[PDB]
Structure formats: C-alpha cells, structure tokens
Amino acid sequence: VSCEDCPEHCSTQKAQAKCDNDKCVCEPI
C-alpha cells in the first residue's frame, strides 16, 4: 500500500491514512 497517496487522498476530507506494515488506514472526519 502507498504511504503518500493513501494519506494525500485522505487529506482531501481532513482524513489521515496510517501506512504501517503495508497497511494504509484511512480515517475520515
């Protein structure tokens, strides 16, 4: 999983994507 586009696309709605162990966790508001 990407650790830049995942969180970047999550930034769109003030969301954050935690990329860890190849696992991106997008968290929207």
DSSP strand E in the chain: where? 16-20, 23-27
Contact (Cβ atoms closer than 8 angstroms) between residue 27 and residue 15: yes
How many whole angstroms separate alpha carbon 21 and alpha carbon 1? Answer: 9
Alpha helical stretches, state H, 1-29: 5-11
Structural biology method used: NMR
How many whole angstroms separate alpha carbon 14 and alpha carbon 21? Answer: 23
Q: In the numeric block, which tokens belong to residue 7?
A: 């969180």
Q: In the numeric block, which tokens belong to residue 16?
A: 């954050």
**Which among 11, 13, 23 is positioned nearest to 3, based on CA atoms?**
23
Residues 6+ apart with CB under 8 A from 24: 1, 2, 3, 6, 7, 17, 18
